[PDB]
Amino acid sequence: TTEDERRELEKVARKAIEAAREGNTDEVREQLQRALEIARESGTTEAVKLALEVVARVAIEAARRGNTDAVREALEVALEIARESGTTEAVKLALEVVARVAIEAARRGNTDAVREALEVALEIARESGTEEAVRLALEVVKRVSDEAKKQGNEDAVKEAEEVRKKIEEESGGWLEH
Numbered sequence: 735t736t737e738d739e740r741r742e743l744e745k746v747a748r749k750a751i752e753a754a755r756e757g758n759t760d761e762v763r764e765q766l767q768r769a770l771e772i773a774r775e776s777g778t779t780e781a782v783k784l785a786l787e788v789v790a791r792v793a794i795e796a797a798r799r800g801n802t803d804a805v806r807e808a809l810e811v812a813l814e815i816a817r818e819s820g821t822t823e824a825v826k827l828a829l830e831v832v833a834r835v836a837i838e839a840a841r842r843g844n845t846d847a848v849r850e851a852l853e854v855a856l857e858i859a860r861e862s863g864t865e866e867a868v869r870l871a872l873e874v875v876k877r878v879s880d881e882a883k884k885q886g887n888e889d890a891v892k893e894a895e896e897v898r899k900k901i902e903e904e905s906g907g908w909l910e911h
């Protein structure tokens with residue numbers, strides 16, 4: 735039921751967050767895989783939402799600690815949840831996770847994590863084949879650019895510019911193709 739999955743994801747979150755703090759890439763990978771499988775097994779949007787929240791918390795912690803591997807693993811799992819859920823809601827939630835992570839990274843001078851997050855935003859837009867996902871991805875890039883400007887993170891401002899240019903140049907093809 736919903737009570738068993740919530741407690742399960744709670745355990746996963748605890749272990750994954752600790753692993754993200756300590757640079758334990760192997761454990762972060764394993765725990766995020768379990769979050770994905772819990773969402774799979776549950777077959778509800780509620781479970782998808784909770785799993786994406788766990789992924790977000792792990793990736794935010796990782797972003798704060800310069801744990802590039804964990805940010806990468808976590809956002810890949812967000813991407814896969816978006817792929818497998820079969821709903822627009824899951825895609826929008828995954829994009830909000832990516833935005834949250836990229837914003838925290840921008841605030842912490844974590845330019846790897848900004849780069850990883852924006853690349854997943856681009857991939858979500860490329861794979862979704864909806865105009866709305868392209869628009870939302872561009873909004874994510876703008877939010878990250880805004881934060882980077884505010885914090886004096888020139889690397890992140892430049893990365894956001896490059897990803898914006900890529901979406902603007904290439905999204906025309908993504909949508910038709």
Ligand code: NA
Pocket residue numbers: 862
């Ligand atoms: Na679709």
